[PDB]
Target: Prefoldin subunit alpha 2
Amino acid sequence: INEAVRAYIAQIEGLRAEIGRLDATIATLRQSLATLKSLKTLGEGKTVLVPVGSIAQVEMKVEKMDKVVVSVGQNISAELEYEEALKYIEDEIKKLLTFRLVLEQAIAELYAKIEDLIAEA
Amino acid sequence: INEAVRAYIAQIEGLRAEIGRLDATIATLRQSLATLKSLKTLGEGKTVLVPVGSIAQVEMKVEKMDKVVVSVGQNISAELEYEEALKYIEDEIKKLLTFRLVLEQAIAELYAKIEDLIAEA
Amino acid sequence: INEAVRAYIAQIEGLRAEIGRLDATIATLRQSLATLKSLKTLGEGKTVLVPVGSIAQVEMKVEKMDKVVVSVGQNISAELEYEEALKYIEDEIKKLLTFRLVLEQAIAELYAKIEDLIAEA
Amino acid sequence: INEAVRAYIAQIEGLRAEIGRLDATIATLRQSLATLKSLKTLGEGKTVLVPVGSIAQVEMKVEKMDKVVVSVGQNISAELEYEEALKYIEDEIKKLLTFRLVLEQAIAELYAKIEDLIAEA
Amino acid sequence: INEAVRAYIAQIEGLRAEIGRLDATIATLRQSLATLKSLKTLGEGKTVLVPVGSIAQVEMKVEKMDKVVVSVGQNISAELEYEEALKYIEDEIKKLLTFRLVLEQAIAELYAKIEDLIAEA
Amino acid sequence: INEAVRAYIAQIEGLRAEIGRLDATIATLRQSLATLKSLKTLGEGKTVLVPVGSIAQVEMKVEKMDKVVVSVGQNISAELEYEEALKYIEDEIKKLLTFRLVLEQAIAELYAKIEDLIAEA
Amino acid sequence: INEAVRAYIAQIEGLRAEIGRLDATIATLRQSLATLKSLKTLGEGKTVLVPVGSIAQVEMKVEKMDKVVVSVGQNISAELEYEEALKYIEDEIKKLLTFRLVLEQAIAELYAKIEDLIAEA
Amino acid sequence: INEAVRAYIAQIEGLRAEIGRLDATIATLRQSLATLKSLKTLGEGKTVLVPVGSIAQVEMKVEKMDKVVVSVGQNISAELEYEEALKYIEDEIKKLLTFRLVLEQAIAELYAKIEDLIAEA
Amino acid sequence: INEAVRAYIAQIEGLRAEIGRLDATIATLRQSLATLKSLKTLGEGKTVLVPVGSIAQVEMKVEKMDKVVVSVGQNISAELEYEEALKYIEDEIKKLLTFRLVLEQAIAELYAKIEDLIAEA
Amino acid sequence: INEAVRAYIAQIEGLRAEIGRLDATIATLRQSLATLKSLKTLGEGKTVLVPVGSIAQVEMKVEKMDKVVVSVGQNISAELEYEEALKYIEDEIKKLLTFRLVLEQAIAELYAKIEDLIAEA
Amino acid sequence: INEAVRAYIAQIEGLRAEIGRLDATIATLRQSLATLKSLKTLGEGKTVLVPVGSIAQVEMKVEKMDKVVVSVGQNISAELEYEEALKYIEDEIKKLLTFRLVLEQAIAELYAKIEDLIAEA
Amino acid sequence: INEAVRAYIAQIEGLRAEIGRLDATIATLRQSLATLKSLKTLGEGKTVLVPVGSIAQVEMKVEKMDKVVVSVGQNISAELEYEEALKYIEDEIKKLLTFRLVLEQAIAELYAKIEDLIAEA
Amino acid sequence: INEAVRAYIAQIEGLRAEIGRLDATIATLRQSLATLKSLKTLGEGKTVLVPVGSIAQVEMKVEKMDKVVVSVGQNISAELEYEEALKYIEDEIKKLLTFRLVLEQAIAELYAKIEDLIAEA
Amino acid sequence: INEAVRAYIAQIEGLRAEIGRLDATIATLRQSLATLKSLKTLGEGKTVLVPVGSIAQVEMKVEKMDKVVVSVGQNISAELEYEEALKYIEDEIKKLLTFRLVLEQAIAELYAKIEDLIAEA
Model:
């Protein structure tokens, strides 16, 4: 009664939090998009500091503007074209947008169930 | 009464999760610590594939085996000696362990408050 | 008596840790499932780096887009349809979600028992 | 009184569990060691079923008898000779053994402090 | 009916987002806490890169270890003791914790109103 | 439819908010642009109050009017000539304006879709 | 027809811009609210720098913890109790919130008009 | 054909609004500058009401007729001579006048492009 | 011919400036609206500082909470009911909104005539 | 050739408009001067209608013959002697007239530049 | 030679001043227009204060919403219908706008003569 | 030499024009004074048209022979005794005559400065 | 005496290792439990790879959806129902939980004896 | 002195336990391999009593008399000939026996070190 509606509210909140995390992930992917574009603007041999995880940054030059390895998923690095792999990243972004739309549909379904429980008089 | 002990248990679990995140951060710092040491095992000029943030990796070489930049806090860069700044990271880890002990004392305090509300009977 | 209350606390803590491990397992299975999907985005013959457990990665090529072996559990293997295996993974994920709901019910039951012990005055 | 001694006991327990995790990690490294050796026993082109992380497996042929990527640490995979980098893994194992000896010395120091507190009477 | 409950749910979501923003602000204050502590660990004269807003960083040294200017609110260049002003920052954090408790009470009030509207049958 | 038109309105408002955040970022970059130019107006050895991130400020001196570090993207430090990297920031702003024009074209596309749905009589 | 839809678009956009301006105004009022509270945290006699509009800040001691002048509106001032006038600020904030609710009602009315025009077929 | 014409018109309008905002900023600088000079006409220790952001005003006194803070930019307030900061603000005003001349040249270039479209016949 | 189109552009700019002045007048009327509201919130007898137009303010109290004089226009005074005359102020604001719509129509007419002169060739 | 002459004419016209605005401001100051004079001719308690900004007027009694507040500039207030601050307003008028004479000298120098452009034949 | 230049300057100045006076006249006629329209919104019998030249106002009511005096040239009025004569006043405003455009053409001719005298050399 | 003489001439002519405008204002107040006398000659309900600014005139009737409002200055009105305020405006005219005599003294002083320049031989 | 303390510590560590082994046994029972459950989900006839104990696997098909053989140990089993033997496994798991609680009691007893030996002063 | 000798003895005991674990592994391989031989003695279609880890056994017909899946190491599978994988496991056993002989050499070398410590008299 009250309990199922509160459960639906907690479900909607978890969906909202996962949508926010997903959008932060998409924004991180677009940051990596801009980063790879910025690398392609830069030329070879230029002194570059790159992080070591934490706030230490070690120094490198540039030598690898041809095309870049990337994970297919979770474990991988295969040297694909940065254009092609970057398009694949955008395809992943579009998949996550579709997933976000499915989650929004789930939010609408939960609100519809709460509406039905209200309409049960 | 019920509410006070409920808030006590909620604070205990919140501090527990914060201690877990703290120790995960400590383990991350120690992974970066060993990563810097493994950088010191290598030599200059060696071709190394390193990530771009997200899961693509680009190619670097070594030229910075003397001293590495790091933040004072949150914003900063400071080219300090890897030994002294490394020990400074270790000291930060020690201070986080001290703060963890303080939080464990606070959990003992909340349990003592629960014991006091018991002893009111 | 009060050590039994602390035992209830430790039970709720261990159930919360089980919730965290279970949710991490579910998220790991979803990451591996999206990894399988990302494999299905690729085609045969394409060179792919894959790890050996530890951080050495050997190079493979794809010839396994037909249908994929998977365990029943802990010892097993059986070649099934990747869509059917997708369904099987999603089903076991939903089973673990239901199990997590049962765990949260047990946590609420333990809190209700603590509240009854408070109400024993 | 009882407090610092019990704290020393808890420290000894945590160090014992960390030594166990360390040796389990070393055993995992040796499993990967023997796995890479058994890969070197095989020749190129051999049809081999390999996992996807989680419990599904995919099929590959062999093309990795020259040199394998390996981490500096936590983010990295640098293409090195399997021989020298594998000996470097063994050297890191020896470093972990040295650290294990230091931890066992620390445990002996903790019991020495306990028995000093005994001898204070 | 459906409308007032939907409005209450939108209110609870806006409160949740504002609590998340407030807690991110508190975390930023604790980052500033750690930053000031890290500054006080540093000594005068040592070269330091500080950001310029955007990702450029310009170079300085330390001469500000006596006591630090801060804002009273929104406008102010008030020079206070870094200890005393840092205690004032912690006092602000405690005020925001109290404010978060008031907001959580408001969330419980909105849930109680939804419960009442359900109980009107 | 009605739902498609409301989805169009939501997408147009999301693009409008993206345009607002984008132009705010552009204005922030131009503020940092003028800030770097104002640093170039000053001389070396000059005592200046500089922030600590949050609202406290510390005291700097000037020694580094030659050329300033900057990120390539998202993680980087790279000491480039302030004029050349400054023009690079300007070109990034130009690309953001181009992307803004693309988003304006997309708003015109959604408006044309609304026009088509009207034209379906 | 198309014109009426475009006019509804421009109206909903202008109302959304009014919502944004009103929310920025309310946020500015709450910043001034916390600023007044922060002034009440201090004491008389303390040396304080305060701005002159632009970035110049001149120095003062405190003598305004008794009761403060505040505008009636647009041209006015009158010395009132900081508590009661602070409450009055909160009351005008709530009136603007009610006004914003009326604005969102008008937006929903405009979308209802859009849906009516679609249902005219 | 006429899209670029309306784009020219919109750019001229945006530059006109930019000139308006810029001259309003310059006039604001002059108002605060004359306010500072009016403070310099006054002597120390004089009781003065000054605002809190919002239109409440707190009471101050004068002791700061020696040298006043000023920004490098966007984050800064460095205590400099009011005469030299005066002249610096005047120089920045002259820079904004030069930029205004450049914008008016750009408007003339847009009408020259209109003349080009005329001459295409 | 081309002079006429340039004159049309100057007319559109003068109309835009008149729209800006008109909206400033409307905002002035809304500030006077809120000021009269704030007057009606205050009671009789309370000492209130009101300006002399320019820089100085003089002191008054409230005794006019019944019905308020206002001009018909430019010369007039007529004591009418503050709510009814305030509604009349809102009515004149609506008249200015209608006039603003007429001006927007005229700008569309001028751009249409420009594009017709284009379409002549 | 023609352009600098036309720009000088435009600058002379803009300075002439500034002269007109300045003298209108000075005349407004003298109107406020005579207004405060006529207030000082009156006595306390006198029933007086005074405006609300816009054309409506509200009723006041007089209690402000002691001495009158005055702003420093754009934000400020301070109670000064009405005679002394009124003399200060007169001094500000003298400053504005001095600045007007400086502008007239500048216009004469602009025509001298025009005469130089003539004399370059 | 230079006398023609000074004559052109004084003519452009006097024409600019008469343009400003004519625009003030047009704005005055529009204010009286809005005043008469506001009288038309009022009804007969309503008590109305009207000025006596100087800023005393005397009281009347409305009886004259049917016909109003007007004069054609420069001397003496006579009474016709209010709204047709109001249209006649608006047409006189349009003819003054035409005359103003003739004066603007004359100013352009004066600068053309300036350019001709420059082009003589 | 003759420069300051011509400046004296310009000053004297500006003061003469201001004396002329002052005497025009005096005659204006006297004609309004005689208009008030004409109001006192008439009786109630009499209908003679009144100027409404422009050539348009509306019809009054008389009900305001008790005592009449009058401005204090620039924004004001207040119902005073028409005879008392009549004498007061007359005394303001007398003070304007006094200031006119002061200006005539200043012109005599300027001619005395001219005589000093004669006497500098 | 202190040998006995070290013996107590070794006993506590052996009990902890036994708890770890027993909990690993329980987790093994749960993994094989859910494995047999997922075997019960699968149907007959499906080709299934199953191990030989050690490294290699052999291929089977399902015909065992009736019920399950089991023994206490090692000589002569008996086929009982899979749900009934499932409950039997769960009962033995509960027995191991009880035994684990007994071991935890024994660890508390050993620490209590250590604390008593400390308390023998 | 004798302590490092006792440490050598503990090392020899750990090596002896490793020898025992290694021989247990080799015996396990031989037992599973003889179980594979017993499988090869059977034929297809025969129901087979197979241990399934825990005390549950299932039944199976044979279809796996062609070539057998087997891991490379820890993760892998490879359908190879049972004679070929037989010889493969045999050669791995030979490698383990070789490593055992190396460990026996290490034990003899440690005893030789202890003999050297005897010889240091």
